[PDB]
Amino acid sequence: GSSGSSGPGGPEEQWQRAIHERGEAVCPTCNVVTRKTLVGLKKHMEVCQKLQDALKCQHCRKQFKSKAGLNYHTMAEHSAKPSDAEASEGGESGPSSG
Ligand SMILES: [Zn+2]
Ligand SMILES: [Zn+2]
């Protein structure tokens, strides 16, 4: 005879073990979310990554804890681009009839 029962605790194993150990499990990325950091933890991270990546420059790859601050820096350090967007705009017509 061969068998084996299963039992997947859930996506709230490491985020929970810390809730009863230290207190709450805030976002390990920005560290900002609901008070229970349980429901607003998975629903938040959704954009978290989307935002973090954005704020994080590409030419320098520096993290900025401020959207407005990044805009300034970008231009400040990275004002001009090492590549120009080819200017190829043609093909026009003039429809005229009754
Ligand atoms: Zn986050
Ligand atoms: Zn930069």
Which residues are CB-neighbours of 43 under 8 A, at least 6 positions away?
none
Q: Are 27 and 33 in contact (CB under 8 A)?
A: yes
Q: Name which of 8, 40, 11 is nearest 24 in CA terms.
A: 40
Q: What span, in angstroms and rounded, lies between the C-alpha atoms of 48 and 30?
A: 8
Ligand lying nearest the CA atom of residue 72:
2
**Helix H or strand E segment including 71:** helix 67-77
Ligand lying nearest the CA atom of residue 61:
2
Q: What span, in angstroms and rounded, lies between the C-alpha atoms of 51 and 65?
A: 11
- Give the distance (Å) from ligand 2 centre to CA of residue 41: 29
